[PDB]
């Protein structure tokens, strides 16, 4: 016992890969890679796939809970917001790979206390004019939940108090101003 068992995760997590193609729809460009529910199977999948910095510009990694797809159209992704992290050109070297890995550990470790059930997933956008890392929640009306997630999210990544990270609902994103900032 406890010698041969894999350390199990709270939730089952599905990893998605998005690659832009003007010839088809946006939903068809988002494709699934695998699923896992243990700490061992997370490292097995992560250690053989590419780093976010090495990805070709225009591609997204998307980790979400099993049952939620990486799109605003999902039930849990409806209404719910986004804690958005903008990264500049030079940040590509070390900050992108380190912030995204730190984001993954906050998801699967469920370190957000009781407000981890509100957390839907995360997405990193490898873009040529910027890079974007985000955490998705299930409801933007829960100010008690949203503020606590983003505050622990900023402490875990270790940003200086000078930089203020923004939270915006997908209703504003799909049509921008922040609802909460830390």
């Amino acid at each position: 016992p406890e010698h041969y068992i894999k350390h199990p995760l709270q939730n089952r997590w599905a990893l998605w890969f998005f690659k832009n193609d003007k010839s088809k729809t946006w939903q068809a460009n988002l494709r699934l890679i695998s699923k896992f529910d243990t700490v061992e199977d997370f490292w097995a999948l992560y250690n053989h796939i590419q780093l976010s910095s090495n990805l070709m510009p225009g591609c997204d990694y998307s980790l979400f809970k099993d049952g939620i797809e990486p799109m605003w159209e999902d039930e849990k992704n409806k209404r719910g917001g986004r804690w958005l992290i903008t990264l500049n050109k030079q940040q590509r070297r070390s900050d992108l790979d380190r912030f995204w890995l730190e984001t993954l550990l906050c998801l699967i470790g469920e370190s957000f206390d009781d407000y981890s059930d509100d957390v839907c997933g995360a997405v990193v956008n490898v873009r040529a004019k910027g890079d974007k890392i985000a955490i998705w929640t299930t409801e933007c009306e829960n100010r008690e939940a949203v503020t606590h997630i983003g505050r622990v999210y900023k402490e875990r990544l270790g940003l200086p108090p000078k930089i203020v990270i923004g939270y915006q609902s997908h209703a504003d994103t799909a049509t921008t101003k922040n609802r909460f900032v830390v």
Binding site: Q10, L105, E110, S116, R156
Partner: peptide
């Protein structure tokens, strides 16, 4: 609920 620390998750890379 199962909670894992950042220190514990790093040690499982091997």
């Amino acid at each position: 609920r199962i909670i894992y620390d950042r220190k514990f998750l790093m040690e499982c890379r091997n």
